[PDB]
Design an enzyme around this catalytic site. Structure first.
Site, PDB file in Angstrom:
ATOM      1  N   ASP A 194      -8.253   4.301   7.017  1.00  0.00           N
ATOM      2  CA  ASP A 194      -8.254   2.952   6.232  1.00  0.00           C
ATOM      3  C   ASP A 194      -7.378   2.857   4.913  1.00  0.00           C
ATOM      4  OD1 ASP A 194      -9.362   0.087   6.521  1.00  0.00           O
ATOM      5  OD2 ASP A 194      -9.815   0.732   4.554  1.00  0.00           O
ATOM      6  N   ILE A 250       0.980  -0.325   2.398  1.00  0.00           N
ATOM      7  CA  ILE A 250       0.100  -0.088   3.713  1.00  0.00           C
ATOM      8  C   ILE A 250      -1.533  -0.407   3.434  1.00  0.00           C
ATOM      9  CG2 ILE A 250       0.437   1.186   5.970  1.00  0.00           C
ATOM     10  CD1 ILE A 250       2.944   0.111   5.028  1.00  0.00           C
ATOM     11  N   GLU A 251      -1.905  -0.175   4.464  1.00  0.00           N
ATOM     12  CA  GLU A 251      -3.340  -1.291   4.846  1.00  0.00           C
ATOM     13  C   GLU A 251      -4.076  -1.518   3.382  1.00  0.00           C
ATOM     14  OE1 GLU A 251      -2.491   1.106   8.426  1.00  0.00           O
ATOM     15  OE2 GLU A 251      -2.624   1.393   6.551  1.00  0.00           O
ATOM     16  N   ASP A 252      -4.264  -0.622   2.565  1.00  0.00           N
ATOM     17  CA  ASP A 252      -4.823  -0.728   1.390  1.00  0.00           C
ATOM     18  C   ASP A 252      -4.255  -0.177   0.103  1.00  0.00           C
ATOM     19  OD1 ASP A 252      -6.945  -2.395   2.410  1.00  0.00           O
ATOM     20  OD2 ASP A 252      -8.097  -0.481   2.719  1.00  0.00           O
ATOM     21  N   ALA A 253      -2.860   0.417   0.498  1.00  0.00           N
ATOM     22  CA  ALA A 253      -1.921   1.124  -0.682  1.00  0.00           C
ATOM     23  C   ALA A 253      -1.548  -0.085  -1.792  1.00  0.00           C
ATOM     24  CB  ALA A 253      -1.089   1.916  -0.165  1.00  0.00           C
TER      25      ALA A 253
END
Ligand SMILES: [Zn+2]
Ligand SMILES: [Zn+2]
Ligand SMILES: [Zn+2]
Lengths: 50, 149, 67, 50, 50, 50, 1095, 10, 47
Positions: free
Chosen positions: D2, G725-728
RNA sequence: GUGUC
């Protein structure tokens, strides 16, 4: 590529489109109450009144 | 009360009114410091009480003496004989009243900092300009004659 | 704890107007009036003085004092 | 993963006999479809698709 | 926390580590970046040929 | 009242993702322990250890 | 249009000024050391010996003093909390009692007799930290914003968590694996916890209690109680056609067995009853005060008990045949438990122990005496009380077998990570159920709780509802008495149950009165009863914390006055309108007419969960109808303390709200006003905390604007090169160099050193000089000439801080130099040297480490959006739009739709408008500011109206086709840096039991390879690597055995055959050989059969 | 019983 | 040689501990003492 | 026991 709050904003012609739906839905749903109270709502499935 | 690392960082954030063209570029490595590529600066202040101030006071501006440290307290000491190059005071902080640290009776601060030459790609403190931006020229073209309202 | 000497985004010196901003908030001036009279025009170098807490003032009451 | 709080681990083979076995069987180019159904698992993510 | 599937099955390994992951779309599909601090600790034995 | 009815369903899924792991991992470790030696021979025949 | 008063938002601060959030934790303790401490003294009042009835002692009065410490010799000086926190001492005050004892023949009354100590809360009534001023709070080195409410034991802050339990003295009727069953739990003040249950099977009722061998028929219990004739039995049960068809079978099986008299039933029961004095008296006293002790019996009358059992049987019958069942998820029945009654039980048990064992201290001295008089104050002790109190607080083992109870994990160390984590822990509530997967109801959000427990506030993980937090507006009721209540109920016209028979209770008009699970009697026209009781409560005669409710399905009125109920104020309305007007609140704004007289003027009132069941509450003042009885003051008080930091909670989704309220306590920031003086184990601090632009009214209520844990930064919602990217998230190198997000870590290193029972001692030599030049050695470099490190120095890896040399047992000394272990290079802040209570020197050191944000650090958006940093971008990139403002943190627009977070954009817009205008914008829940008046204000300046701006890309130099979303956002830095979450090991220490890597990074261990990762290697089919990293790199051992008899030999030699002829060796893991050597001692010998690998 | 203020020479 | 100078936390008086003495203050009754800063030269970075 | 996946 960006997203803001202006992207998700209701249109003026959209607010009155769902107003009609909500009003008709309320007017139609609030009739089945007294319809059940009077004794109605012929049932196709094997079930109870509520 | 302030940290030593935070104090050094805030002192490095202070820009210096100096001409970097005369100074050289430092070789690969040396920390002793030569005369041509290192500028010395001294700072020293200790807080003392005011004997004359008043009977009963709460405001610390007149109660305590030298409670707020500015960049004007920093003094430039010559190293070598380059004092006659810059006549009197062309080497001084640009802004004089910048809060550095706060002192109380029984506190002392004494530091000696070295100023060197560098580029802004290494650290943000070596940025010679505060704001560097540009803008495209606007153009507003009307099509049809408008009415009053 | 203390007002930053420079701004975080652009790098404009914002640490030389904190005491002036404090002294100008007591002359019956609005926060916006002080902020646009000091010299701040954009908003990246304006919230450094507007949204800022002063904890070193409360930390000096617990500081060692001489007797 | 994630990519907000994930901490993954890493191992180092010691003998030369196992260094060649993890390259032909546990290979990134070899292992691209999954034995469950047979669909490719490594194609793209949101940003590349957009 | 026994000896059958706790020790025999487990058998904690050496020459390993674990660290938080970060994105880097500048490598290949079969590549991974290892910090130099971990690479200095890890060692790989090999015999010297001609 | 709408916020409460909306957060009622959010707790329906947050308590469901906490419990699945237990019996799922239990059924996984119960299913692996029975099928872990079934191999294919060289005459196109699958046999067990016996 | 309806008259609306926009003033009721100032009632809530005045109400929290009286009590509320944490003031109830102090209220439970201030009431306990003033009411219950003397009730326990009056309970255990007279105790005498049995040698001769002439010696006795009497308890007159007991009280506690102020926090004092006993030093070297009669030195009692007032101590401050900070001194106890630094000296590893314990905050306690003595308990001085005035008892009298008779020695010889005359009586001695010794006043001010000390018997022990007792801990005192930080903000209690007996402490020094009360009624002071901030100038005086700074004199004692204590933060004035500290809410308090914890216990200081051995220099740690311990708080007792609130624990919820089920209601006692009540009847439950629940269904189990076969059918339905009724149960009753009984527990009064005296220690008697009973659990009786009536079950139905084969149309036959059976009563189960653990004191009886097997089932006893209910009709037998009735005949034994005293009701003999079977007609009045059914009369008391119920006179109905369907209740008799279910009660006939039991009557006829009762007639089957020859029991028709009271003596027959008593003998039957006594024969059934087993216990480890005749059978008749046994059965009589067992039915008297064993089964149901919450129903007192005056002389020997079992009538109240039999009517109680009859109404229980009637409730079970009405439950039978239907789907009406009672659940344990209702919170109107669940009660809360604070730290007061726990301390009460502990103190009464310690007092009873101290009275009963000292009764035996003077019982072995009277016959075996030496003189005529016996002194008891010299036969007195003051260590068991203090020992027990400190042990129960610090250890956490509440074990009272006198009370038949064992509880673990009740007290916990106070979280001092941030200012929200400290206050949010005080409102944390623990459940009675253990953390298991079976539970789904209690974990599910119940419709019962409304404004009492925060729905969003809950940790996500294993416990997903077992831990709950209190709401902003709620109160915990303490216990009362019922004298005047019963008196007024009797005067109202309630009937005595002992006069009317069983037939009248079956009447529908008849209503039964219940008071704390006790039948008072029969009342007719219960509406007048409820109305008069409510009017008397609003008057002021009866206390306001008395609940009254009515249930029509069973036709019973409940009167609840037990302590531990949830109470929140509600505004009363009268037939269309709120009693509170503008003139009533103008006086409150003036400075008079506060909350207590508002309650005295019958304008607001408290309601419980069960009392609001029969009441109609209006949300706003435009929805007030003709049947609404009460009006909720404000709707935004439903959110908790951790959920009050989220801008526009209704805009956000509940998973994001939960994530953010969970991450709010992990966010690092400033702790308090005195963080330089306090020395805690681990402390995280920030450099320059900013103030949230879009603040909440809850922030102002807690005064979070004085201790913020975040910073405002310019955010640009757009994709960048490759690292969002997803949480960066992307950072700005120039901003990080300027100092955005500078953190500081403070570690504690303490060392105590003491003497022994002999004349041996410890000593600190100090630094080591060499013979070449006069320099301290590399080992002891930071050490001062005294022997310790001086503050203001820099300690590197594996260097000595303090020299500790202690004797082996003239004597030889082994040096134990404390060595600092760390990958970083720490700095010394200060050094403290003091003494503890047991005459030992304590040296504490505080180590400071400044850190900067890098790739691998976790940040949050205060909106349930967490992510590790991606690529650090310089200032040549990060495009400016027009004026030259660069993005401080690049946000990705791809995580917005799935997470479904709209409050983020609204908060950004409001913050931008605020920083442009120059005033903070309110963003409270269910209100605040709209997006219609703010966007039209963003036009006056000259910017675009909603969110858009023209940007000029920097890496190319070309404008952007689409517009980008720019604005200031309040971001916060969290813990779990990549600097600490980074480990590696090749060859380190091993365990002595098994040769395997140890556990944990603090001992430089390795990683574990479990079975699920072994299954992945098995599914592939690789055998070389599976054996290489389980046997070759973990534990490779060479053992030897014999061919004649399989056994473990040694040195190529067997002790069974005494011959080395048949000897061979093999490679085995040490674990398998250890298992073989362990099984051989279990009469299990693994006879092995070797073979050649060639064979 | 304590002993401080020492320097060991090698 | 030179008596180890220690500072108090209530009166901030610089006293000395001779050898194995009751750790206290000669002015007040406070039982906790602090230490002075080192007189060496430590280098710091302004980056 | 607490915290994260
Ligand atoms: Zn700026
Ligand atoms: Zn043998
Ligand atoms: Zn002193």
């Amino acid at each position: 590529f960006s997203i803001g709050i202006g992207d998700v904003t209701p249109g003026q012609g959209l607010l009155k489109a769902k107003y009609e739906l909500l009003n008709a839905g309320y007017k139609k749903c609030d009739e089945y109450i007294e319809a059940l109270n009077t004794g109605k709502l012929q049932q196709q499935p094997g079930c109870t009144a509520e | 009360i302030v940290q030593d690392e935070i104090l050094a960082h805030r002192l490095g954030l202070i820009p210096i009114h100096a001409d970097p063209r005369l100074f050289e570029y430092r070789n690969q490595g040396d920390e002793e410091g030569t005369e041509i590529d290192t500028l010395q600066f001294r700072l020293q202040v200790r807080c003392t009480r005011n004997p004359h101030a008043a009977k009963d006071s709460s405001d610390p501006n007149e109660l305590y003496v030298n409670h707020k440290v500015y960049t004007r307290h920093m003094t430039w000491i010559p190293l070598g004989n380059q004092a006659d190059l810059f006549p009197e005071g062309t080497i001084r902080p640009v802004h004089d009243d910048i809060l550095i640290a706060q002192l109380r009776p029984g506190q002392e601060i004494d530091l000696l900092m070295h100023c060197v030459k560098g580029i802004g790609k290494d650290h943000a403190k070596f940025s010679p300009v505060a704001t560097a931006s540009y803008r495209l020229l606007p153009d507003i073209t009307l099509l049809e004659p408008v009415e009053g309202e | 704890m203390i007002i930053p000497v420079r701004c975080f985004t652009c790098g404009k010196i914002v640490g030389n107007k904190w005491e002036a901003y404090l002294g100008l908030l007591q002359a019956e001036y609005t926060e916006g009036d002080a902020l646009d009279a000091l010299g701040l025009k954009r908003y990246c170098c304006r919230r450094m003085l507007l949204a800022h807490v002063d904890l070193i003032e409360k930390l000096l009451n617990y500081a060692p004092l001489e007797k | 993963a994630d990519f907000d709080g994930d901490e993954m681990n890493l191992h180092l083979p010691q003998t030369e006999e196992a260094k060649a076995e993890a390259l032909v069987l546990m290979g990134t180019k070899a292992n691209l479809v999954t034995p469950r159904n047979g669909e490719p698992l490594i194609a793209a993510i949101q940003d590349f698709l957009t | 926390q026994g000896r059958f599937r706790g020790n025999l099955s487990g058998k904690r390994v050496d020459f390993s580590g674990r660290t938080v992951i970060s994105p880097d779309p500048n490598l290949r599909i079969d590549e991974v970046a290892v910090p130099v601090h971990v690479a200095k600790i890890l060692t790989f034995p090999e015999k010297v040929n001609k | 009242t709408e916020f409460f009815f909306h957060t009622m369903a959010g707790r329906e899924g947050l308590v469901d993702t906490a419990v699945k792991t237990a019996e799922t991992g239990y059924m996984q470790r119960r299913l692996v322990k029975s099928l872990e030696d079934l191999c294919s021979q060289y005459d196109l025949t699958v046999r067990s250890s016996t | 249009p309806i008259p609306t008063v926009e003033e009721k938002w100032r009632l809530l601060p005045a109400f929290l000024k009286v009590k509320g959030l944490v003031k109830q934790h102090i209220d439970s303790f201030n009431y306990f050391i003033n009411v219950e401490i003397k009730k326990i003294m009056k309970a255990n009042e007279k105790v005498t010996s049995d040698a001769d009835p002439m010696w006795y002692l009497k308890y007159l009065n007991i009280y506690v003093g102020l926090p004092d410490v006993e030093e070297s010799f009669n030195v009692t000086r007032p101590v401050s909390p900070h001194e106890c926190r630094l000296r590893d001492m314990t905050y306690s005050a003595p308990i001085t009692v005035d008892i009298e004892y008779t020695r010889g023949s005359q009586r001695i009354i010794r006043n001010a007799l000390p018997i022990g100590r007792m801990p005192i809360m930080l903000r209690s009534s007996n402490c020094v930290l009360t009624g002071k001023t901030p100038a005086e709070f700074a004199k004692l080195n204590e933060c004035p914003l500290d809410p308090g409410g914890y216990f200081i034991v051995k220099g740690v802050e311990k708080v007792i968590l609130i624990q919820e339990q089920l209601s006692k003295n009540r009847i439950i009727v629940e269904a189990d694996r076969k059918g339905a069953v009724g149960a009753s739990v009984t527990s009064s003040t005296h220690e008697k916890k009973s659990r009786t249950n009536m079950a139905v099977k084969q149309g036959r009722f059976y009563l189960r209690h653990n004191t009886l061998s097997e089932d006893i028929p209910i009709v037998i219990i009735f005949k034994a109680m005293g009701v003999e004739s079977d007609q009045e039995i059914v009369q008391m049960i119920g006179t109905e056609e369907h209740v008799m068809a279910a009660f006939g079978p039991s009557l006829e099986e009762c007639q089957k067995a020859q029991i028709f008299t009271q003596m027959q039933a008593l003998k039957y029961i006594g024969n059934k009853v087993r216990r480890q004095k005749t059978k008749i008296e046994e059965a009589r006293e067992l039915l008297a005060s064993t089964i149901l002790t919450h129903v007192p019996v005056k002389e020997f009358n079992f009538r109240a008990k039999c009517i109680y059992t009859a109404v229980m049987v009637r409730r079970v019958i009405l439950a039978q045949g239907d789907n009406k069942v009672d659940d344990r998820d209702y919170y109107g029945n669940k009660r809360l438990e604070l730290a007061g009654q726990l301390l009460s039980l502990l103190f009464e048990d310690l007092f009873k122990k101290f009275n009963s064992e000292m009764k035996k201290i003077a019982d072995q001295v009277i016959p075996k005496q030496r003189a005529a008089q016996f002194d008891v104050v010299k036969h007195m002790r003051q260590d068991q009380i203090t020992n027990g109190m400190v042990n129960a607080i610090s250890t956490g083992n509440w074990s009272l077998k006198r009370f038949k109870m064992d509880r673990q994990g009740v007290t916990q160390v106070l979280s001092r990570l941030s200012y929200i984590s400290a206050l949010g822990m005080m409102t944390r509530i623990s459940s009675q159920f253990e953390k298991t997967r079976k539970v789904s109801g209690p974990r599910s959000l119940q419709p019962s709780q409304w404004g009492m427990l925060c729905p969003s506030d809950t940790p996500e993980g294993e416990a997903c509802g077992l831990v709950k937090n209190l709401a902003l507006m709620t109160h915990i009721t303490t216990d009362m008495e019922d004298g005047p209540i019963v008196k007024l109920a009797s005067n109202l016209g309630v009937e005595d149950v002992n006069l009317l028979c069983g037939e009248e209770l079956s009447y529908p008009n008849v209503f039964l009165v219940f008071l704390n699970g006790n039948i008072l009697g029969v009342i007719r026209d219960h509406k007048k009863l409820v109305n008069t009781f409510r009017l008397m409560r609003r008057a002021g005669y009866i206390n306001e914390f008395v609940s009254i409710s009515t249930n029509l399905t069973d036709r019973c009125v409940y009167i609840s006055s037990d302590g531990g109920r949830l109470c929140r104020p509600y505004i009363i309305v009268k037939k269309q309108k709120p009693a509170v007007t503008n003139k009533h609140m103008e006086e409150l704004a003036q400075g008079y007419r506060n909350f207590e007289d508002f309650l005295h003027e019958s304008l607001v009132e408290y309601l419980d969960v069960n009392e609001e069941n029969d009441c109609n509450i209006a949300l706003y003042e435009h929805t007030i109808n003709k049947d609404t009885t009460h009006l909720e003051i404000e709707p935004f008080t439903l959110l908790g303390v951790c959920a009050g930091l989220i801008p526009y909670p209704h805009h956000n989704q509940s998973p994001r709200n939960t994530y953010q309220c969970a991450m709010g306590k992990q966010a690092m920031g400033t702790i308090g006003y005195n963080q330089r003086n306090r020395i805690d184990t681990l402390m995280y601090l920030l450099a320059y905390p900013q103030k949230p632009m879009v603040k909440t009214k809850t922030i102002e209520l807690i005064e979070f604007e004085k201790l913020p844990a975040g910073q405002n930064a310019t955010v640009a919602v757009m994709s960048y090169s490759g690292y969002d990217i997803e949480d960066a998230l992307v950072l700005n190198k120039a901003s990080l160099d300027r100092g955005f997000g500078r953190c500081l870590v403070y570690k504690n290193a303490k060392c105590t050193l003491k003497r022994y029972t002999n004349q041996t001692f410890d000593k600190v030599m100090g630094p080591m000089l060499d013979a070449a030049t006069r320099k301290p050695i590399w080992r002891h470099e930071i050490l001062d000439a005294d022997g310790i490190c001086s503050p203001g120095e820099k300690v590197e890896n594996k260097q000595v801080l303090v020299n500790k040399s202690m004797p082996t047992v003239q004597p030889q000394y082994k040096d134990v130099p404390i060595t600092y272990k760390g990958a970083t290079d720490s700095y010394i802040e200060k050094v403290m040297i003091s003494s503890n209570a047991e005459d030992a020197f304590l040296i504490k050191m505080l180590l400071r480490q400044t850190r900067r944000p890098e790739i691998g650090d976790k940040f949050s958006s205060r909106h349930g959006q967490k992510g590790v940093c991606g690529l650090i971008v310089p200032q040549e990139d990060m495009p400016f739009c027009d004026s030259g403002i660069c993005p401080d943190i690049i946000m990705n627009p791809h995580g917005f739709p799935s997470r479904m977070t709209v409050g983020k954009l609204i908060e950004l817009l409001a913050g931008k408008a605020g920083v442009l205008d120059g005033r903070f914008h309110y963003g409270t829940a269910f209100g605040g500011s709209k997006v219609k008046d703010v966007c039209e204000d963003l036009v006056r300046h000259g910017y675009n109206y909603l969110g858009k701006d023209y940007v000029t890309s920097g890496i190319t130099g070309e404008p952007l086709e689409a517009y980008i979303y720019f604005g200031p956002v309040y971001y916060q830095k969290l813990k779990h840096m990549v600097l600490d979450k980074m480990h590696a090991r090749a060859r380190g220490p091993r365990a002595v039991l098994t040769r395997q890597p140890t556990e944990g990074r603090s001992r430089d261990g390795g990683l574990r390879l479990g079975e699920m990762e072994r299954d992945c290697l098995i599914g592939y089919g690789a055998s070389m690597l599976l054996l290489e990293r389980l046997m070759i790199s973990s534990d490779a051992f060479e053992v030897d055995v014999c061919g004649q008899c399989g056994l473990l030999g040694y040195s190529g030699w067997c002790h069974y055959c005494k011959s080395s002829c048949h000897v061979s060796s093999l490679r085995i893991p040490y674990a398998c050989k250890l298992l073989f050597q362990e099984l051989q001692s279990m009469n299990i010998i693994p006879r092995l059969k070797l073979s050649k690998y060639n064979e | 019983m304590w002993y401080l203020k020492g320097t060991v020479q090698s | 040689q030179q008596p180890m100078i220690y500072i108090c936390g209530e009166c901030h008086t610089e006293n000395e501990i001779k050898s194995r003495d009751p750790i206290r203050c000669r002015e007040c009754g406070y039982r906790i003492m602090y230490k002075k800063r080192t007189k060496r030269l430590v280098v710091f970075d302004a980056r």
